[PDB]
From a paper:
Rhodopseudomonas palustris propanediol utilization protein (RpPduP) reduces propionyl-CoA to propionaldehyde and shows promiscuous activity with acetyl-CoA and other CoA-ester substrates. Nevertheless, the observed promiscuous activity suggested that RpPduP could be engineered into an NADPH-dependent glycolyl-CoA reductase (GCR). Thus, to realize a carbon-neutral photorespiration bypass, the reductase should be engineered to preferentially use NADPH over NADH so that reduction is favored over oxidation.
The variant with the highest specificity toward NADPH had four mutations: P222G, I257R, N261L, and I280L. We then carried out a second round of saturation mutagenesis at second-shell sites (T196, N197, A296, L481) and identified a variant with four mutations in the acyl binding pocket (L326I, P327T, V329T, and L481H) in addition to the four mutations in the NADPH site. This variant, named GCR exhibited NADPH preference as well as ∼12-fold improved selectivity for glycolyl-CoA over acetyl-CoA compared with wild-type RpPduP (in terms of kcat/KM ratios with NADPH). The X-ray crystal structure of GCR shows that binding to NADPH is facilitated by interaction of R257 with the 2′-phosphate of NADPH and that binding to glycolyl-CoA is mediated by three mutations to polar amino acids (T327, T329, and H481), which may form two new hydrogen bonds with the hydroxyl group of the glycolyl moiety. In GCR, R257 (Ile in wild-type RpPduP) facilitates NADP(H) binding by a π-stacking interaction with the adenine ring and also, a charge–charge interaction with the 2′-phosphate group. However, the GCR crystal structure also revealed alternative binding modes where the adenosine-2′-phosphate moiety assumes different positions. Nevertheless, in these cases, the nicotinamide moiety is still correctly positioned to catalyze the reduction reaction, and this structural heterogeneity may contribute to GCR’s cofactor promiscuity. Our final engineered variant, GCR, exhibited a 1.1-fold preference for NADPH over NADH. Although the evolved enzyme accepts both NADH and NADPH, the obtained shift in specificity was sufficient to prevent the reversal of the reaction even in the presence of equimolar NAD+. The kcat of GCR with glycolyl-CoA and NADPH is similar to that of Rubisco (∼3 s−1), and its affinity toward these substrates is not limiting (KM < 0.5 mM).
Numbering used by the authors:
A (entry chain A), C (entry chain C): 82 to 522
B (entry chain B), D (entry chain D): 83 to 522
The structure:
């Protein structure tokens, strides 16, 4: 009588275990699904586990900050849709009744990132189990200890609820070699990749159904009609949240010249440290960029204080982002730093900002933000930029369900088109036609 | 001048469609509506309808003229338009949120020789309705009819002021062209309607892909069924377009107590029963290959024609060839796509369901059941987990011809989209207006 | 001085107090509504108050039993829809964006039944407050003490939650004369009536928007294809639930002759006491009927043990209903007894049973039940009888959400056509048209 | 032989509709679709369309022919058919639950002289779509045009194989006949499109009744609005059908900074501004009664007509009569239903919203606002709480002409149905299949 904890020595064993679990899960009720989904929430939302997970992940990856991981972890456990997300469509007429249902895929193989290692395990497992699947996690090696502990905790709770063993599994030695082994396993029916563009292309080359949640470079546009004070507060909060490691965070400002100066003034009131010295700006570049001009790993997810500390500047906790006005070609603008480093580009009109916001978004079709009260301008940018998420007059994280209407998720699929994934995304659509019967209108 | 939609190289076609898509983004929803209506008019024009139905059967040698008239009309009438692109909305204290269906870009579509014109009509309507351009990569066996339809569509759209090259294809449809479309960097989405090899290929391209694979639809008949009604439905669904629809019945699983009565009524409604094993081996030698798969020359041929090729002369009233064989028999396991319908006898309805899942080969495509017991209909529908499940009717009722719902000719099982429509070819986007527009 | 407890001396004072409160309620947020809705749930689902309410109702009215009010009150508190029932429809296109919302009516005047006194208040208040209304409750004289107590407990919880005073109010001495005043008070902008056919025609004659939950006479049809063992168990549970005082409970069996005997056999196994002596059946009629021929108020809602004991028959607690086979003309068939007395009419064919079920239903179009595994026959009866609720192969209370899919209500509108009332039913449909803006598809 | 739908007595019509509705229950949804379409063909037929529009203004003396063509066409094109009767479904461990829209029975509709043909066409399509029969009780003034429409409908329905008397009316429409219909026990639901007195009476008949009340729609223009676009939209919406449509603009509330520039642009789009109070006092004496309410002889007359009745000659370019009066002015406070548009100047947008609510008289019918500030647009929509709210467009954009959504000519403020359609004329029914058909 040895109950599994869900962590296996090899990827092949994890997949076979999750496959057998999926067959048994098919014999369960929707009520059973709901109890297991509620068990996952209970795990992450238990105040102790919540605090450990949040602190443990920041320590192991060095990315993010504790207080905001508490919020994001809670957001995942509280506002990830459950079985209620699996609605039913019905059409009744002379030819009978037709029902359309969301049924399970089978064994799903999920690949999680280093920025949100626990939040993405919580969100994926809740939605995938709600849809009747089993999930194999290939986590980032840099998030091994915390990712594996969370899996063990989930299995523990699920075992106490009488669930079939191994609904959620991972490997004891997370590595890229194991990810590839999962991507190649015949019994994996669907891949869900949350990471960079290189990962998204890989899973879309396996011969399997695959949801790809790629990267972005979210611009935020502030036009002359905007509540500048509010925009400044929303932009600093949105940019500095979790030290800018959320895929939706603001990562460049495109301000209309008429209001640019007053914006910068209010930015500095809300904790923005403006770098005006072109020599100090070069020190920051040397610190955060690599030879290839890309973000330096050791700096990703560090506070603005820490980053300024590294170049000999000492500031207090009130400073949340580092701010600089630079040309549109600057690397900080072009690159996805994932740091509380926020460039600002000055443009003449609101239409110029929209054009440059589309250009600098690099056609990721991911996220973009705009501050403005003119319904016409809000409509124009939203229509043109064609991003999976578009926030107006609020912090970027309002698109995640924290501050805006809608549920929350941590797998945002721009490329593959599924949008803000939920249990619906991890389900096959089925049609059931009862001919000339059950039409009782 | 103005493009007829056909190009010499695949790279030329994709580039043309890519620019048309950019131009298409400037058009209104009203423009999409007219262009969609234009495609309906092209195929619902009685003369073009008859020409396309006849020309398709002649070129591919598969199907029959009268039933192509029905399928082509279904694709043009019941394929959803821009009304399929609905808007979700949530409003509360944090303002308003909208969820919309937006364009994917340039879509490359591979279409089947069995339903060459129906798929082009169904695909393009939904794809252009979602704001996309489409590059079609037909198969060689249907080259002429597919190119004629593309040109006709480009004509009608040009008369409606549409950006040129919304629907394009190459002059020499070939396998190497398909592989080029699959690799071109401007193709944002692939849509494959065909066999398992095509669906796996398309899913190995590093692109978003919809895979509408093959099936082996079993029809289960239990002891609670209306036997003579089930006999008529089975024969109609099986022989429709000579069985080349991916959803048509292709093997019967009958409970033993009613099997003799089912066979009886099947013969009363156009089934030629084969009881002599000598003739059964003849039919196998004709329609099977050395490896054991369906013979391409026999696919899509009527029951009369097939029987003629083994010296049996019957009248037009015969629509299917029926035989009672074991479950391991080739006709059961293989997707013949012919009006040849093997029957397998089992003891109980539970054994029928178990065998129905096995014989479906995890294609998870289509299954049929005849039964009046609501508990048994529910059991089989839940367990077989196919994309379409039809109860107490012909298989084509799940296509929207005799059943509720819209119609499609690309049914995605592996990739899970179900019955593809305009929504299938769109990305979901979310628009959050923070703390405004909540007017409740 | 102190906050109102919700009870007022005159009806005018309560309508005025609710009119002011509803205006203050417009200044509240959807998040506030949710807390107020959750407050009502917390009140009735508080284990002590739950038992207290279930006990008081049965004692003060003499109808129902304690164990089953525990369930009905819990159902009303757990499965009544909240604010989430107020969806939003959107339409985007060339002409812009159209929203359709559910908005408040204002002050709602609600008349509750003596049979379901606490359950209707919980259900009505939740739905009406979720929609942004204030409710004036006009309970019947019998349920005075329990009604005022629930109203006082609601006002108490809402006050702690910071709500405006007097969102839920009633009068100190409920009476027919107070109900009439409420029905004619100008500031009352909607009437929701849960009761008999007289009350429904009254509110529909006041010159106000009125919802009318009428009476019924639910027949249960059993044909030859039905699982008879389960049918008997379900019919007994559904008929005896709360001693038959729920408006949806089975109140006459229409059995196909071929299975009528085996049905009666299993009914007896499941707690049915059959009366075969016509002299004994006569004693029951003299007890439960009036001179006019209607149900005796004294006997409404009493258990089967009680009713038998009052004609000199003692039985143990395993008896739940009194069964007798009678002609269709019998008064137990024609009358809505609201007692655990269940007649059985034998017919030849299932088409005969369907024809008779329609007749006996008396065009109430309220509730009906059928037991059958034939999909053709289930459809036939459902289409033809055209009732607001139709239940198949289960106890009648599955239409209430207790054993069936959907939410729960205790105000089922047949005449006015709103169906299973919820928050939507107490809200006005509004259209907002943004011309040529916010069409960001 | 076949009835034409017109009956001498009310009891005969209601009895005929009752019998018709019984026979209607046996018809398929396909039949309803056909009957619904048949009504669309009746009014969209160009000859009838022009006949009805012309015959209506001539008989009633209200509105004008050009705009009745648009409204009648709107009623026939954009009134939802049977597709409005959607089905909700919930499936789980406890089985399947369907929610359907079923018929009420016999509906008694009361149509206004303002929109006599439009209301009949809209109500009949929706009521027949839901599966009901309708007994129309027109007003005396529109008798001839109403009865001609009913007769054309019964003719076309009779050709389509419909049960006789799905749509009926009486030969001599009167108030006694309206009261008879209200009391008849076989009338299951009453639908009232008219003034407040009608709504109260119909809600006192002991029946289910939808009441479409009156409105006094204000239009708020604030300093963030496109003044040129606003001036053009206001004149067009106010003058449309000479202001008889219940949703049309009937008073302007303008913020002070833009009031003069708004008046300036209103005149450039067809507004004759009155500044001589002596002339205003003439208009008051013409278009009002001794009591102070609208004069029935002036309702629905063009601005050119109303101006000539006080010795002022203008050409067909003048569409409305403009004047800036204080809040208490009769024009402002009364639902004139004439192209007479008063303006009230206010200091801030907040003052305008407060006055807009005040002047709307709690009818909660219609309100319009011109602004680009998403925050201020939201504030007025949230607070005024009207059934229809239009932002940055002419009022009639709420009827579906110029805005998103379907069209209706019965707008229920008091009873809360909103923009009525086939759904509004149906009962909600729940069907519960316990522990079966849960096939997910
Ligand atoms: N749209 C969203 O929902 C979302 C959410 C969060 C983050 N992101 C984005 O993802 C990135 C987050 O950081 P990250 O470093 O953890 O992402 P990552 O660099 O792509 O790595 C994630 C996983 O992908 C593996 N991987 C990468 N390329 C692979 C390939 N060709 N073949 C097989 N496996 C491959 C990685 O192995 P290795 O360990 O060797 O790299 C790792 O296991 C950011 O770009 C962020 O914008 C997106
Ligand atoms: N799920 C759906 O929605 C759906 C719909 C329709 C069909 N299907 C499935 O599509 C499949 C239809 O098969 P399909 O053949 O039309 O498309 P396909 O199987 O995917 O591809 C067949 C093509 O390969 C070549 N080919 C096949 N056999 C050949 C042979 N003996 N010799 C030379 N070339 C050969 C031909 O191309 P060349 O022109 O180059 O010779 C032929 O057109 C069925 O399995 C059907 O069930 C699915
Ligand atoms: N569709 C639904 O949702 C629904 C729900 C529940 C009930 N119903 C139907 O409502 C009816 C039950 O309603 P109800 O019982 O609460 O009220 P009721 O039966 O309509 O009448 C009882 C109330 O009215 C007075 N009354 C009438 N007859 C009386 C009598 N013989 N003796 C003393 N008082 C009498 C009493 O008022 P005083 O207290 O002032 O004496 C009593 O409280 C049933 O017909 C039921 O089918 C429908
Ligand atoms: N909410 C809506 O959908 C809607 C639509 C249109 C109109 N209305 C309201 O209809 C009312 C007036 O139209 P009406 O035809 O009834 O004229 P009316 O002025 O209200 O008088 C009704 C009839 O009494 C007398 C005349 O006919 P006889 O003397 O010949 O009998 C007259 O036609 C207006 O107040 C309008 O706001 C509402
Ligand atoms: K950047
Ligand atoms: K086969
Ligand atoms: K009864
Ligand atoms: K006015």
């Amino acid at each position: 009588a040895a109950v599994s904890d869900g962590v296996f020595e090899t990827m092949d064993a994890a997949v076979e275990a999750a496959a057998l679990a999926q067959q048994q899960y098919l014999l369960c009720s929707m009520s059973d699904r709901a109890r297991f989904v509620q068990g996952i929430r209970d795990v992450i939302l238990n105040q102790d586990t919540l605090e450990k997970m949040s602190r443990m992940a920041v320590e192991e990856t060095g990315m993010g900050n504790y207080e905001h991981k508490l919020i994001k972890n809670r957001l995942a456990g509280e506002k990830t849709p459950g079985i209620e997300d699996l609605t039913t469509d019905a059409f009744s007429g002379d030819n009978g009744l037709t029902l359309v249902e969301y049924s399970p895929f089978g064994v799903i193989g999920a690949i999680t990132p280093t920025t949100n290692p626990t939040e993405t395990i919580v969100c994926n497992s809740i939605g995938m189990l709600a849809a009747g699947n089993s999930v194999v996690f290939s986590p980032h090696g840099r998030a091994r200890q915390v990712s594996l502990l969370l899996v063990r905790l989930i299995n523990q709770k699920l075992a106490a609820l009488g669930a079939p063993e191994n609904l959620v599994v991972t490997v004891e030695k997370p590595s890229r070699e194991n990810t590839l082994a999962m991507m190649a396993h015949p019994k994996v029916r669907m891949l869900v990749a949350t990471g960079g563009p290189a990962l998204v292309k890989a899973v879309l080359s396996t011969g399997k159904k695959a949801i790809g949640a790629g990267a972005g470079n979210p611009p935020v546009v502030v036009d002359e009609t905007a509540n500048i004070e509010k925009a400044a507060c929303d932009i600093v909060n949105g940019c500095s949240f979790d030290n800018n490691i959320t895929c939706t965070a603001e990562k460049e400002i495109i301000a209309v010249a008429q209001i640019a100066d007053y914006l910068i003034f209010n930015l500095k009131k809300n904790g923005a440290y403006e770098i005006k010295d072109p020599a100090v700006l070069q020190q920051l570049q040397d610190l955060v960029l690599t030879a290839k001009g890309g973000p330096q790993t050791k700096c990703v997810g560090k506070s603005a204080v820490w980053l300024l500390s590294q170049i000999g500047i000492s500031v207090d906790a009130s400073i949340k982002i580092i701010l600089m006005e630079v040309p549109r070609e600057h690397p900080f603008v072009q690159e996805e730093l994932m740091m509380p480093i926020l460039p600002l580009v000055r443009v003449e009109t609101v239409d110029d900002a929209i054009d440059l916001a589309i250009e600098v978004e690099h056609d990721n079709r991911h996220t973009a933000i705009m501050h403005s009260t003119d319904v016409r301008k809000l409509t124009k940018m939203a229509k043109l930029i064609q991003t999976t998420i578009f926030v107006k007059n609020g912090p970027s994280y309002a698109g995640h369900g924290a501050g805006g209407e809608g549920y929350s998720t941590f797998t945002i699929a721009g490329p593959t088109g599924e949008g803000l994934t939920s249990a619906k995304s991890f389900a096959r659509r089925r049609k059931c036609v009862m001919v000339e019967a059950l039409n009782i209108r």
